[PDB]
Amino acid sequence: SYYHHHHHHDYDIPTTENLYFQGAMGSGPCRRHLDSVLQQLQTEVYRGAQTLYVPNCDHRGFYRKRQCRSSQGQRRGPCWCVDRMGKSLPGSPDGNGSSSCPTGSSG
Template structure:
């Protein structure tokens, strides 16, 4: 994350772009559901990850309204 922030500070161009910031818990682990922002909407593409941020296969979807409890938590960790 430090590298991304440094790149933004030193970039010679001021081009608007979306910066993805992961959704983490208080202990610093990734929350199960991650979403990229999308212009004009609350959320864009969302996906599930394990607590270390590794994407779980077959768990990508569009529309941030899908609930985490619909996912079998036994596959996490």
């Protein structure tokens, strides 16, 4: 943030809000898995490794809508929707509902 230097967030104080800087979500293990994989893997994965897939987590930190395999050359994933637990929904409305993804339950 540079538009206005009025950002406190983290300065140099070992506190709870400062310790919580790990961009976690609303009690969800997917964000922890995403930050760990996206911080280390997305850097050495996406550009040149193979076709590595990254989990998607909603503000509640769970794998809510997406799970996708990422190719190194083409932008195609392919991407696919999953339920709040992160299960790949092939075409099940009991899983591919607004709770996981907004719209797209072609099954």
